Amino acid sequence: NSVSVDLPGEMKVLVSKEKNKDGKYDLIATVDKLELKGTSDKNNGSGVLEGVKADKSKVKLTISDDLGQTTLEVFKEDGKTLVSKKVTSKDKSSTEEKFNEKGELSEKKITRADKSSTEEKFNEKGELSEKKITRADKSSTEEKFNEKGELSEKKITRADKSSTEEKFNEKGELSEKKITRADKSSTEEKFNEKGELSEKKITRADKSSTEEKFNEKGEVSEKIITRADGTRLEYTGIKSDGSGKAKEVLKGYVLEGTLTAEKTTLVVKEGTVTLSKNISKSGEVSVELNDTDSSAATKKTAAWNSGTSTLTITVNSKKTKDLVFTKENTITVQQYDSNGTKLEGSAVEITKLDEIKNALK
Amino acid sequence: NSVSVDLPGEMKVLVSKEKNKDGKYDLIATVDKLELKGTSDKNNGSGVLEGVKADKSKVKLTISDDLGQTTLEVFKEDGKTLVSKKVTSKDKSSTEEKFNEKGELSEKKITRADKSSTEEKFNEKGELSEKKITRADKSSTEEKFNEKGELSEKKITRADKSSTEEKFNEKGELSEKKITRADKSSTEEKFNEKGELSEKKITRADKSSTEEKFNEKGEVSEKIITRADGTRLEYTGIKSDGSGKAKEVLKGYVLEGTLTAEKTTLVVKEGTVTLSKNISKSGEVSVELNDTDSSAATKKTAAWNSGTSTLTITVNSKKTKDLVFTKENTITVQQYDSNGTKLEGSAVEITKLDEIKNALK
Amino acid sequence: NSVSVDLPGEMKVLVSKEKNKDGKYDLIATVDKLELKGTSDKNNGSGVLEGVKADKSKVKLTISDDLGQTTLEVFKEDGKTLVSKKVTSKDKSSTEEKFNEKGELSEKKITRADKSSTEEKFNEKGELSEKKITRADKSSTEEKFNEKGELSEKKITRADKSSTEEKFNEKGELSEKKITRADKSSTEEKFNEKGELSEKKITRADKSSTEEKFNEKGEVSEKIITRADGTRLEYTGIKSDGSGKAKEVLKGYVLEGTLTAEKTTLVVKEGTVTLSKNISKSGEVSVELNDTDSSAATKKTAAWNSGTSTLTITVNSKKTKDLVFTKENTITVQQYDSNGTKLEGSAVEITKLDEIKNALK
């Protein structure tokens, strides 16, 4: 007595074989466990079907004449006010809509045949609150909005899980931006009241980081190199000629000094002795020792062995101590014997500025 | 006896000046060399005209009430099973459809008023086959789907000749993506079945490339730096402190060594002599030689000149050899005279690891 | 007699209270000083409205089903040829199109809900002329094309104002690339008509710079090194071994001279007294003085001490001048007493070249 026509969205519509009493084709379909009834002038499956839900909501299926689009509407009890609308097409793409309790738009999702989609939500005043764009390869950019339609949050998600998050002030101007990659590493930028860069911190996967402050002239006014081992170099008050004050912060003490474009000089003085930690522009440590003392039996000198980062000090023809500047960024003292030819005991890590100064006596 | 009305789809319908014997207006038009005849109540040009092709297939032209649309249908001999359908509107937008022998959809091209278009092909079971989107700037994305209707392949081609190729697996999951830029360089990514990046490969404009394997923590486990000259640095077993095993694959021989945060050291030992090719993080090479031998009569010292990438070897105050490390990534030997001052012969290219070793003797 | 409904674009559709003669709903609105009559089945403000401009141009507003989008087209007198099209949408995003005098695209602008936009200009033939994408964080890819459709300029500006500029040729090949960072530091490369690197300039964050011009074979034909305090060196006409004419540019004065594979020699004379400043490949500074005079009580000779870079001059067995060459790159002259035992007062920085020729008298 009837043939089936199968439709976009996996559904079938049943058309009467012969025309009915009114001169119309009867139509019957089952959607979400609910039976729908309809008539039309055509026998191909086109036309419109109604049905009522157990909760008195009204359901309206509408199939287009060429059968390439089903429209499924869910109305409240009164027939006028909308609850949800789904448009589906032969290529599987769709548009699903949600509505508030006035039949007015809440949510809209558009899904394309390649499964990509853009989504939008609207508050009760009809102003955008969030928008999400999902791409063919599952990657996503979500953005949030305040009540005055302005932007407040943006989050790009990359195919490689890497994400970028961007905050905006109440005015929609960029206030801050952080890439966070698959390494656990990240680059983070702060932006001033004028849209300019004020702060930049590149963190690396081994917890290490480098951070620069920027000034009115957009130069690097300060730089903080943070090493993975916890310590750090701190360059403050950087001028235009690449020079400023340098401060190395170690577990326990602090080494202080100067910066020039070429090299960082970290000095520590004790009586006439000044020890000098030098770092090149590339970052290779080197150490030197100078002594004002005009007395041979007490004048200190020292040789630097860059292959073992050790510095050996001598007094009156005799090696006194080895200062090693270790790869984990610590200094260790070990003493020589009275003959000045054998290292005694074991290395000792220096934990106080007073202990460096103590070796310089 | 009649008036031409020019229509959308560039065609004209002819309408007679007054009615016919049955009170209707006569309409005649010629389409692709076929004369279509029709009768309508109205004389504005609107109505339906039919004609029959010589192979018996029926043509139907339907001009809308307001002359705002033309539907040109072409059916099989039965007049019911569609073969093609074209709906052109007044703003020049259009819709071309092609049908299979069952009268079901096979191609739909939608053309918009600004000449841009979306085009879709469906297979014989009615699943999507491919989709092509041409945009205003002539850039175009080409998507291919499988017999099951899931995405398999997508290629964006941009107006600047840049392209983003994406391949997908049996599950609609991104397996591999290749962005290639307008400057002819290209980032390429591969993905495991978990979503995570398994391999990245950056090719530069000059055909040099950096291939990277990633681990489960996201860190880089293996690196292959390929130079333009074809030779490659193979870093493998890369540990979290930045260190790892290294291998340089040169024409005819392999240098071996280790890798640390700052540099790659490539080592070749012969007797007490050890030659060391050092490569910087920026790829800057520098060589040095050391010799355990004490006998001034046979100790090899060597000085490096970075300006010409060359190492001269010295035994007994007299220069012995030049080892030049070239920009095409080769090494050449040239002996001095017995007086130790004049280079003799012509430089000779080293091709064997023995030949480097034999020069260090 | 009617009720207001507000729409995307902040415009107003008036729909009449109920049906009239044909059973339809009358729609009316105002757009840019023009009234537009319209009619429809549904009553929510959906449907089409048409109106005639004073210059005979046609206007067609188009309001969608869910009331979320307005289309405002304007046509030439015919109603076939497009002039303008402005789609506006509920999320406040928008799309404007301008058409030349065959209804064919000239400019397309897309404004998004997050206030950002892309812009496309087309040429009189129909090709893409230029495209600028602007993002929420104000980051921007810009590109311009020649009337031949080929790419000419591609510049990417990042959120923090750091940019990457590429210029191409007539054949669509890379000719000039410049990466420029937020440190104000920048790399710049220039490629010849054959794709090889012809020119290279790295500007660093402290305004330090290295320029290298590469010749026809690929070698370095010129080099210009600029320090952090502004002063610089010019190496011009470099050959295979490294031989070429050198030049130094210090604040106030310029030393001319020669550069060979090992070092740079700058030559100045006062009489036969030739002073030579010598800079090694590593940059180690050294100075010496030769006199052709055959008189022991007047002949000038000087000593070089590289422990404090001082050049001590002596004439007639008596010390006269200390020429200290400082690491901030200036020269100082501290005179001695009449005998040559005591130093007089403080040092004096040289401000003219006339103050280097005047010392060697």
Q: Determine phi and psi for A81, rounding to 5 degrees.
A: -80, 130
Give the mutation candidate from C5, C67, C160 for the A interface (greatest A CB count, under 10 A).
Answer: C160
Alpha carbons C306 and C318: distance in angstroms, whole number: 21
Alpha carbons C159 and C96: distance in angstroms, whole number: 26
Residues in chain C: 361
Name the residue with tokens 């022998």: B101
CATH T-level assignment (fold) for domain C1-80: Lipocalin (2.40.128)
What are the structure tokens assigned to A81, written together? Answer: 């006010």
Q: A62 to each of A11, A74, A85, A88, C30, how far by Cα in Å?
A: 12, 11, 11, 11, 33
Name the residue with tokens 């001598």: A314
For B9, nearest residue in chain C (alpha carbons): C80
Element (H, E) at C354: helix C354-357
Q: Is B308 helix (H, G, I), strand (E, B) or coil?
A: helix
The angle formed by the CA atoms of residues A275, A256 and A221, to the nearest 5 degrees, is 140
Alpha carbons A32 and C9: distance in angstroms, whole number: 37
Distance from CA of B167 to the nearest CA of C (A): 26
Q: B65 to each of A20, B14, B41, B48, C41, how far by Cα in Å?
A: 30, 15, 11, 10, 16
Residues in chain A: 361
DSSP conformational letter for C355: H
Residue B253's nearest CA partner among B125, B361, B357 is B357
Using an 8 Å CB-CB cutoff, list chain A residues near B120.
91, 113
Contacts 24+ apart (CB under 8 A), B223-228: B225/B283, B227/B329
DSSP conformational letter for B216: T
Measure the CA dihedral A334/A339/A341/A346, to 10°.
-30
Distance from CA of C105 to the nearest CA of B (A): 6
Query: In this complex, do B241 and A206 lie within 8 Å of one another by their Cβ atoms?
Result: yes
Q: Facing residues of B84 across strands? A: B74, B98
Give the mutation candidate from C143, C151, C190, C192 for the B interface (greatest B CB count, under 10 A).
Answer: C151
| Contact between C266 and C246 (Cβ < 8 Å) | yes
- Residue B159: which of C82, C99, C131 has the nearest Cβ? C131
| Contact between C321 and C334 (Cβ < 8 Å) | yes
Name the residue with tokens 């070796």: A359
What residue ranges do the domains of chain B occupy? 1-80, 81-261, 262-361
The angle formed by the CA atoms of residues C278, C284 and C289, to the nearest 5 degrees, is 30
| CA B100 from centre of chain | 34
Q: Facing residues of A333 across strands? A: A323, A348
Distance from CA of B139 to the nearest CA of C (A): 10
Please check whether residue C184 touches A, CB under 8 A: yes
Listed in sequence order, the residues at least 6 apart from C255 whose beta carbon sits closer than 8 Å to its beta carbon are C247, C248, C266, C267, C268, C277
| Contact between A286 and A278 (Cβ < 8 Å) | yes
Alpha carbons C203 and B131: distance in angstroms, whole number: 48
For C99, nearest residue in chain B (alpha carbons): B114
| CA C190 from centre of chain | 14
User: Burial, C206: exposed, middle or buried (Cβ in 10 Å; 0-12, 13-18, 19+)?
Assistant: buried
Residue C241's nearest CA partner among B307, B348, B344, B326 is B307
CATH T-level assignment (fold) for domain B81-261: Outer Surface Protein A; domain 3 (3.90.930)
Query: In this complex, do C228 and A241 lie within 8 Å of one another by their Cβ atoms?
Result: yes
The angle formed by the CA atoms of residues C72, C78 and C83, to the nearest 5 degrees, is 40
Alpha carbons A57 and A83: distance in angstroms, whole number: 9
Using an 8 Å CB-CB cutoff, list chain B residues near A183.
218-219
For A169, nearest residue in chain C (alpha carbons): C137
Q: Facing residues of A203 across strands? A: A186, A209
Residue C229's nearest CA partner among C243, C209, C244 is C209
Query: In this complex, do A91 and B122 lie within 8 Å of one another by their Cβ atoms?
Result: yes
Residue B201's nearest CA partner among B185, B219, B217 is B185
User: Burial, B59: exposed, middle or buried (Cβ in 10 Å; 0-12, 13-18, 19+)?
Assistant: buried
Please check whether residue C284 touches A, CB under 8 A: no
Residue type (1 letter), C273? V
Distance from CA of B238 to the nearest CA of A (A): 13
Q: B334 to each of B110, B324, B347, C35, how far by Cα in Å?
A: 72, 9, 5, 93
Alpha carbons A93 and A84: distance in angstroms, whole number: 17
Q: Given 3.90.930.1, 3.20.20.220, 3.40.228.10, 3.20.20.140, which CATH number is that of C262-361?
A: 3.90.930.1
- The reported resolution of this PDB entry, expressed in Å, is 3.1
Using an 8 Å CB-CB cutoff, list chain A residues near C92.
128, 149
Secondary-structure percent of chain B, ordered helix, strand, coil, rounded to 5:
5, 55, 40
Distance from CA of C55 to the nearest CA of A (A): 37
Residue C32's nearest CA partner among C107, C100, C84, C67 is C84
Using an 8 Å CB-CB cutoff, list chain B residues near A182.
196-197, 214, 218
Alpha carbons B325 and B288: distance in angstroms, whole number: 12
For B89, nearest residue in chain C (alpha carbons): C80
Domains A1-80 and A81-261 share a fold: no
Q: Is C356 helix (H, G, I), strand (E, B) or coil?
A: helix
What are the structure tokens assigned to C191, written together? Answer: 């490629």
Element (H, E) at B175: strand B174-180
